[PDB]
Design a protein around this ligand. Structure first.
Ligand SMILES: *[C@@H]1O[C@H](CO)[C@H](O[C@@H]2O[C@H](CO)[C@@H](O)[C@H](O)[C@H]2NC(C)=O)[C@H](O)[C@H]1NC(C)=O
Ligand SMILES: *[C@@H]1O[C@H](CO)[C@H](O[C@@H]2O[C@H](CO)[C@@H](O)[C@H](O)[C@H]2NC(C)=O)[C@H](O)[C@H]1NC(C)=O
Ligand SMILES: Cc1nccn1CC1CCc2c(c3ccccc3n2C)C1=O
Lengths: 394, 394, 394, 394, 394
């Protein structure tokens, strides 16, 4: 030979090479690819459509007996680059595809002098997964990625791992944080899928486990929920016979019903009904209708509608018993005129004695029901805290 | 011959192969493809645009007399992989396309030693279908997928099924649940479409039947609808002559009119007008205007506008009859002064006797109309339940 | 010859075939394509951007003298399939393109034994059209599709119809209904476009005519518009001197101003200003400010501000004339004390005689203005109906 | 020769043709393309992202010495069609690209018998431009399109115009109107860009000038802005001591604060802060807080809080001076009883003489401040009109 | 030779050229590309998804020993254009890709007569970056772009800069301003990445530093925040015993709670919780509940509920001490009648002496708490200004 360059190697082993045949000498031996995956970003999690969108880095190698040479007599070269669209490439797909992601192409591969062809490529993938929203801001997910050959059976293409499955589990090296989702582990597992006898497909199954960072959802829906509690605590300081107390309570019930609608648009719920957050807002509604149902009852008792005497059954029971529980001819003709005028006033002042007994009853019930409502807020406030400390401790 | 590899088979039957001709020896026999479909995901159902978006797995096989060999004298090989873009592939399309879905390509096929070419491919498909929204949260749909050859007539390409149509009906194996739609069955049916004489197109028609899971739409629009009923039940406890009762009722009618607008944006309605849910909200409006039209009538009767006597026709009819139905010189000159003062007060106290008769009438009408409104809520509440039990039982 | 297959025909007429030349023997004769179109779906109508999005089925045929053979001595074959990317295909485009729609490719054509090449293909097309929104829910549109050759003049490519233009007008066979738009007719027309002398382009122009189904827009904006009328009719039943009547009227004017904003976001308007619906909502506003301007006038007259006598010009004119139009030493020292007390009360009771004359005037004006407002609602209600019956009858 | 067809010309000049070389005999002469552009549609103007989206029609011609023939001895043919992907095509791009628009391909070109190759193609283009929003509904824009060769310098590719730059300016022939933007002119200009010595790029620069049609934005934000003025004009007719006047004014200030938020979402603002429309809404707010700050002052003066005498400094100044400016043993024991009763009433009636002086002051200030507020609305109303007439006149 | 054209050079060096081999004579020397980047536009910054979208201009050159010629004997040509898809091109990608941006292709390169191949191309790129939103309207960002060879190691492809890294830092020449983001500098840095021994990848890392223009976010959320302060300042001018003062304060607390919701939708927050703007709105809420908690306390003290004497401990402490701190048989029978009438009035007037002491206390507390609230607004107003002047000065 001569020494024109060292492209004469690439002339030697791609002259009569057929890129359609599965590259083995004996057709009874399978081609064994070897894959692994490191995780780069969680792009989107769609809880409504049950669709996960990620981005991984991927690599694989296999072996072919048509790409071999002796390293000497080619000036000691041991590896070179060959374009991707001129050799045989296996068809490794994912079972959980629902769409095609856009990813850059890598137009070259490595080839060592034994036939080991290495292939590095990144690929965005959109998959379908089952998402449980039982406990919304504190939830781990368990999504699957199943690499498999879509056509070839197990006596043609077999799938192994590159490296040992302990290094794949504990590899959080190039992941992008600060993005609402925290990667925990990526655990691989081989299983040998078969649809019947004599048609078996090898497949490799990766389980990704991600956990939501709950810090976003303690200022968007926990902060106004405890804020409209303390507005009702200062709302009971109004005296009941004023008139604005009824207009006060219906205004913020209108104000909180707007809050339930505008926030439930940005919080999904699938296949369960509601999460456990939706239970803890019905308790917020029921704790506020009882606030409205007790100011609707004092106003009915404290009013001037020409009403009768307070019952002495319920005067002894209320005023005197709750004082230790919560608190601590012309001379005749003019005489007929004046006695009728006095009768017109002694009818009037006892009608002012109507209210002062019912005002006294209506104030003792208002301070009694204020303490019971203040405990029910306080008893439920520690229950919401003492469940959060169970999660936070380890 | 020699033994250089076993790509000499692929040299043998793709040397002078023409990928343009329909592959038969005698041109009078049709090519018979054989298809079937299993269902993977319901991606989107657009009730406004009448467009369904799914994702299926698809496979097919046919037969060609140009891809045949004897299995012996090729070292007993019986099947091999051939790239897809180097053989004849039939053009099986869908009639109901409105767009092109993105799906991965599969670059290989199988070829057995008789000519049976097998082809596996997944394909996302966007179709047009007729959607009935007559009963919104409880509705089954009946969508069609019609596989047909777009150019070739029935004496060129004929379509059969792979397997028997009982296995295709009862195949819910890899479907993705927890996604608002439940797959019921996929039923195939062959029919022989013809536009005129001597131009007949074979086609295979799959009917997918899906049912909506109604659990999403019992917390988003059933829960506030029964909530603003119980606010009006505690709204009648206000006495009518206070003044805030009219301001109470108009506030939540404003509050519910916001609710009808914000929820009807996320609930579609096509070609019918409204579903049966929209009928059951006009009843919610008419049951609340009557709540406003009766507090607008007691306030007109219970007021101090210098008004006359209550009619004894309507005192005997109301107070005494509904008590068993629902409830159980200087001596003359000073005398002229005092008699004029008494006349100024005996005019005043009978004007306080104005209201106490009309307050008494206005309270009996308020407890009478409270019972009738409480039954009409209760009579309609059981009717809404007793229709739900008909659906739920089988 | 031999009998190896019958691909020897396709070897015969695609051996030395050049797919770049316009296929005629004499270069002076034009190639005459023949097209027609049936309509499949109206996908989107964007009134803001003036862009129509449809989906049609399309077919065409032409003639070439290079694809001819005698049917005998090829075993009586008369037609065959040839791939599309190996023959000459004319460039028929649309003038009104603004974008490229995604549509499936059809990789085969028919070729008869005279040169008649048939080509079936579906194609989604996005076009630009002029949309008049003068009368919004009752509007027909007149959109154009202009098929033309983009490069070749009329002495190279000429365009005819497949079938007669009566069959193209009356062809509503595979159109997808229940989709807000109803197809009326598709009328073709040939016209011979020229930019100057000796450069003339043949073109075929289809006019599609679609009509909007108005049933969607009688429950989304007609139903709340007549609903807030009847709330004002029961709003005049409040007596004016109560105080909540002013707070009642401003609440639903706030409530209707929200309705004008949230509904005008989903109703377009281009190049005219407003449609005729927007005129019929300014009348709804002006009919409700007059409702607010008359309750602002009775409250000014019916009030206790230490005011003077009602004018006897306007007592004879109002109370007595509208009763037939709408309705049917110590004895001296004590005497100085009592006469001063009587003077303190006879000043008081005539101040109660202030209001009872002005209450009587304010009630007659309230029942007078109630009848005039009730007719103006009733006179405008029949005018809105009697224009709808003109449209509905034929 | 023979007469087999007239594709023997296309065999003559595409046999040994190389589509990679820049087609000149002498390599020192540049290839001179000649372009022009007519404008078809303004698809989108994104004021937030500074991105313009249009659609043009484009054509160009150049000259090559490899595509020449004598018209005789080819049966007098003078031009023919050649596919586009088999000749040299220059790389004319735009500097202002930010994305790639989808546009149809035209697979043919013309070639005359001197080498003049003509090329017609439409192309959608998305560009980046500077948009000034200083005066929002009345604004012209000045966007640039710069055609240039991306690689070749000026001694390889030079750019000229097809026709004279007066015809390109005054060409509004196929533009699509009724689309919020009106085309004014398209003015071309050649400039010779150079990055240093001996590397100069020729470029042709088109300036498009578009003007917004302001009719869309006189019914969406001018009509409610003048509507909530006239509600405050009829809002001053309430007497101040009623009580609903304060609740009236805060309701529509709530009602207008909703209007500022919902309309500013659909009105952009970049790099300036606000346009001049945002200045004319702060004036609308400041003209309405002064309406609230004067009803907050009369209610403070007109009230019953056990208050003292009106100051005679401010009684002479107010009541009597503004009447020409805006308006036009037993006999002793009973005597001690009656004198104490008279003292209890003569204390009461002078407390009714409290308010009637302060009511009289509070009514004169209310009619005084009503005239000043009515002029300030009227003085600003003509200023808003007299600036609109400056724009409208020429 | 002859002189047929000067495409005989392009025949000379692309006849037997292989576009797959890495073009070196000795395979032990690496190919050294040389890149740089100028910055054109910041298209989008997505703070939620941590994704940056830009558009750059890019160029590179390398050297190959297969594209060399002597400039003489080819008529002195020194450079020419060669199509891009017929030579070797290195695979320079970015590590931070998450998607593929659409960018125009440039189909030509330059080749000098030593082998220097130059390549100009623009490219839109979508990358992933870490965004800190600790201080929202005043924030610089530090995003990375890492150019690297995706397959070849450092003994195959090595990366250098075109020009010195001082010119790349100070190059703001063609950047598009007026677009919410200001470019500060683009600083390059070479680092030599290695995954283990004997596998090292060269990479070049550009740091772009952008700063947000804060002018957009001083009219959208600073202007209504200081506006609803001055409405509460004129809200304390109401006297407390009127009744509308409680209804005034709850209306704008409803009005500001709408403002917090509608503006927080368009303001992102990631991985921190809230920015420092969210701290300065909780102070706006706490400064307004204290405004509501002090009008809820004066109304409780200033009311008529049949209450007792003001405590002389708190009369000396309040009224007299804060006056220097903030402010500056028949004769017996008729006698029994009149003494009972006087007793009925001397009970009444001292009940009018109930309120005038509590009105006097309630007015001194109202002017005292008005000054303290007016200082706390004024003390916090200068603190918000004096932090803004620290940023603005240099
Ligand atoms: C995610 O879901 C997997 C289900 O396939 C896990 O399940 C079980 O895991 C154990 C060991 O990890 C396997 O032996 C077992 O076969 C497997 N179950 C099935 C049905 O395959 C996995 O553990 C889950 N992850 C987490 C973190 O819970
Ligand atoms: C952006 O972030 C960079 C981090 O990689 C900067 O960090 C440090 O910069 C100095 C000189 O600029 C380097 O010597 C040092 O290696 C580098 N740190 C690391 C970990 O690489 C850079 O300065 C930052 N820019 C700004 C403007 O802060
Ligand atoms: C980023 C980069 N710079 C030059 C090349 N590359 C790509 C690259 C480098 C290292 C690497 C992978 C990978 C993919 C899957 C498992 C492990 C992996 N490891 C270690 C890659 O894809």
């Amino acid at each position: 030979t001569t020494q024109p360059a060292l492209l004469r190697l690439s002339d030697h082993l791609l002259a009569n090479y057929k890129k359609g045949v599965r590259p083995v000498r004996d057709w009874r031996k399978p081609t064994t690819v070897s894959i692994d995956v490191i995780m780069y970003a969680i792009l989107n999690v769609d809880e409504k459509n049950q669709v996960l969108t990620t981005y991984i880095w991927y690599r694989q190698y296999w072996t072919d007996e048509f790409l071999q040479w002796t390293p000497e007599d080619f000036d000691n070269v041991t590896k070179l680059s060959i374009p991707t669209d001129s050799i045989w490439v296996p068809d490794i797909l994912i079972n959980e595809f629902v769409d095609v992601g856009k990813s850059p192409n890598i137009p070259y591969v490595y080839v060592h002098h034994r036939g080991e062809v290495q292939n590095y490529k990144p690929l965005q993938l959109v998959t379908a997964c089952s998402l449980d929203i039982y406990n919304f801001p504190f939830d781990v997910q368990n999504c699957s990625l199943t690499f498999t050959s879509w056509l070839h059976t197990i006596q043609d293409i077999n799938i192994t791992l590159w490296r040992s499955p302990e290094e794949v589990r504990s590899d959080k090296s190039i992941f992008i944080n600060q993005g609402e989702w925290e990667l925990l582990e990526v655990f691989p597992q081989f299983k040998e899928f078969s649809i019947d006898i004599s048609n078996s497909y090898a497949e490799m199954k990766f389980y990704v486990i991600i956990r939501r960072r709950p810090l976003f959802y303690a200022v968007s829906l926990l902060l106004p929920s405890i804020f409209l509690m303390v507005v009702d605590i200062v709302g009971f300081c109004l005296p009941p016979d004023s008139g604005e107390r009824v207009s006060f309570k219906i205004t913020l019930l209108l104000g909180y019903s707007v809050f339930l609608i505008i926030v439930s648009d940005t919080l999904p719920a699938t296949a369960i009904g509601t999460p456990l957050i939706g239970v803890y807002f019905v308790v917020c509604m029921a704790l506020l209708v009882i606030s409205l149902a007790e100011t609707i009852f004092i106003v009915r008792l404290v009013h001037k509608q020409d009403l009768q005497r307070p019952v002495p059954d319920w005067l002894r029971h209320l005023v005197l018993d709750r004082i230790a529980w919560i608190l601590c001819l012309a001379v005749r003709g003019l005489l007929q005129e004046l006695s009728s005028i006095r009768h017109f006033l002694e009818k009037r002042d006892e009608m002012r004695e109507v209210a002062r007994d019912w005002l006294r009853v209506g104030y003792v019930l208002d301070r009694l029901l204020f303490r019971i409502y203040l405990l029910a807020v306080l008893a439920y406030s520690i229950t919401l805290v003492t469940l959060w400390s169970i999660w936070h401790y380890s």
